[PDB]
Amino acid sequence: GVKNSIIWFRKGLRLHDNPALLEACKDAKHVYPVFVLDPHFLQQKVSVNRYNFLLESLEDLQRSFQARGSRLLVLRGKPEEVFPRVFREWGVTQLCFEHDTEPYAKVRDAAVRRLAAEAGVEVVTPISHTLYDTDMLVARNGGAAPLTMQSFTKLVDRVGDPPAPAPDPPAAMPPPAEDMPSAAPAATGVPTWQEVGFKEPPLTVFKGGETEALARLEAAFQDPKWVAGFQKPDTDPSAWEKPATTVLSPYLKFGCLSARLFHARLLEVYRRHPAHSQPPVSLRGQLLWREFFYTVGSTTPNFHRMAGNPVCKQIDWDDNPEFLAAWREARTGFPWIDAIMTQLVTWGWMHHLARHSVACFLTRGDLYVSWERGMEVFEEHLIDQDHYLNAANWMWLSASAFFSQYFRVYSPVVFGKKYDPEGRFIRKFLPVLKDMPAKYIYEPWTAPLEVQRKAGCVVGRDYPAPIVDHAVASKACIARMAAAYRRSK
Ligand SMILES: Cc1cc2nc3c(=O)[nH]c(=O)nc-3n(C[C@H](O)[C@H](O)[C@H](O)COP(=O)(O)OP(=O)(O)OC[C@H]3O[C@@H](n4cnc5c(N)ncnc54)[C@H](O)[C@@H]3O)c2cc1C
Structure with missing residues (x-):
């Protein structure tokens, strides 16, 4: 039969460095890009700034899929309930998504895998949120996470460079099939902050999405000497007009920016500037703080x-x-x-x-x-x-x-x-x-x-x-x- 795939977004809200996406697209007749939105999430403490950053990030994703002949489907509900039904409706043979090591993610993902297995759906879950497979790091360390950043940095260096970013996806993508009721545009669009039920607008100055992430990446890399000499503890917390650090953290949190792309770009600069700062204070050291805390946190x-x-x-x-x-x-x-x-x-x-x-x-x-x-x-x-x-x-x-x-x-x-x-x-x-x-x-x-x-x-x-x-x-x-x-x- 034909391959019909789902690419399920949770983090990894990007087209670049997305091995899950690339697999979903491979030999596929139809691809269903999915984000599962809980319509009662705010009836439970979440800022409109935070939620709207997500919404803007999903709007950017929508534009990127639309430019390549496809469409993001924002399914309303809970993944465990929604997926079994769309698996059958769409004749799905493969479900792809980026691995996530948070505690709730592990419970949810185990349940979706079981459901996929019952439906005869192959699951592919590449690691691309973190620089490394963090379980691999723990295993290479003798079974426990390193408990200092110094020893963690030594471990990653023994392992070597993180994997390169995966290639960009194709200029055209297989779309969702026609006349699929769960893919109806009216039920699957990216809502606004008003529609999710906030009564006060977002005030934040940083806009969501991959497009903005990549633009901010290029801005930081505009001065390679700044990138090379970066020392975290010497940066100015009072700088707000032009913040003293990258402000890539929201983009890295949602996966609008790839950590591996960022890391690869850092190494490029570092090769041309052999006196560059080293961990922990360097810009690479900052991605290692993140990796260090993901590794310890996921195993504690x-x-x-x-x-x-x-x-x-x-x-x-x-x-x-x-x-x-x-x-x-x-x-x-x-x-x-x-x-x-x-x-x-x-x-x-x-x-x-x-x-x-x-x-x-x-x-x-x-x-x-x-x-x-x-x-x-x-x-x-x-x-x-x-x-x-x-x-x-x-x-x-x-x-x-x-x-x-x-x-x-x-x-x-x-x-x-x-x-x-x-x-x-x-x-x-x-x-x-x-x-x-x-x-x-x-x-x-x-x-x-x-x-x-x-x-x-x-x-x-x-x-x-x-x-x-x-x-x-x-x-x-x-x-x-x-x-x-x-x-x-
Ligand atoms: C109390 C407290 C709470 C924090 N909560 C968060 C949080 O919820 N989310 C978050 O991303 N960071 C958090 N940080 C870490 C750090 O302050 C931010 O990552 C940093 O301020 C983000 O700005 P930047 O992107 O300009 O950092 P840059 O200095 O430009 O660093 C690049 C990237 O490395 C990572 N990074 C940098 N510093 C750290 C660090 N100390 N620990 C872990 N990762 C780091 C981030 O992904 C960041 O985007 C917290 C720090 C403190 C002290």
Whole structure:
């Protein structure tokens, strides 16, 4: 008989470097590009920024398939229920999709494989979300994931280069068959943020999709010397007009950009610049942080929680809803913190060291609230929200796993001031402070009342007083952390 295939998108929201897609197309009479959208997903905490970035990414996919004589089908429902019916309707002989190592993904994918088997459908699941087959890495390491980035980097180097990106798909693709009721255009289109039921528009400045991802890739590679010399810890968290890092994270999260393409492009530059930066600080090192946390996270039970998580220190975090709320709502009274939390909710992206500042403040630095609570807030609002990376970094920042130097505490006043003494970042995200003299903008409570009134920003009415004294709070937290480390024996 003829081959009729499904290419199922979940991540990997791209045509480039898509071995799943290339297989689906091979010798196929009809190809059905599918994304399965849960129409009740938002009736359960998800930002319109995040969801709309997905929608824009699916719109871009739709355009790309339409340009090649095909069409993206956005099926409504649950995969386990939808696939059995479309398998029979479409006479499907092959289902292809990119492997996903998240916990829910593994449960869902096992069930779809069983269903496919019952229908006589071959399943093909190439690895292309991560640089490497992460189970292969664990296996080559003797059965456990490396637990430091140094040892992880050594492991990947023994394995060698990640696979090259797969070729671009053909200029024409086999379409869905005609008169297939589950492929009706009216039931299978990409909805708008209004239609999924949001009442407030997205404010983020970064647009979804593969086209934008590739454009932003080319922008970053415009200066190869910048790419070659890139050192992460030396980049500026206060830069917002021209962010100091690539802002490729949302594109990498959704697979609008291939990590292997990015990595291959880095090696090309590196060959022409043999003095380039090395891991962990290099741009390649950044993709390795991602790979490291995917590898550990995918092989650790309860990785996104404290209890029952074998890598995580059990810490006596306070049940402090008022402190969490003040942090989440950008009303701590420390303009650096509040400006970053404002960027979180308005853009859904902040620089890495901005995330460091706010996460340290929430957890082991000032407020002693669980990292699980911070992760949850980040999960709601980040356009790059990534299960493994979010958990791992919150555990790092809280000195719960990977990192143990709890005497290193960032200052919510001093940290940003060393980059941006003018307070340009604060003024942008906290316009109530836009006329405050630079001298006081990180510590507005120290402005004379005449200065506050003249600025139109009186502390305690226009902008909150600080919710803690940093010196007192950090001292208290450091003592609690020391005690928590002693109890774990
Ligand atoms: C508390 C906290 C929570 C975080 N949550 C997320 C999240 O949900 N999703 C997410 O993608 N990143 C997260 N990060 C990591 C990092 O801050 C972002 O990946 C980075 O800010 C993205 O900006 P960029 O694309 O310009 O990074 P670049 O510096 O240009 O790096 C290129 C890519 O490497 C990866 N990367 C870079 N830094 C890290 C890192 N420290 N850990 C893992 N991968 C990295 C990303 O895919 C990134 O796009 C978190 C960090 C902290 C401290």
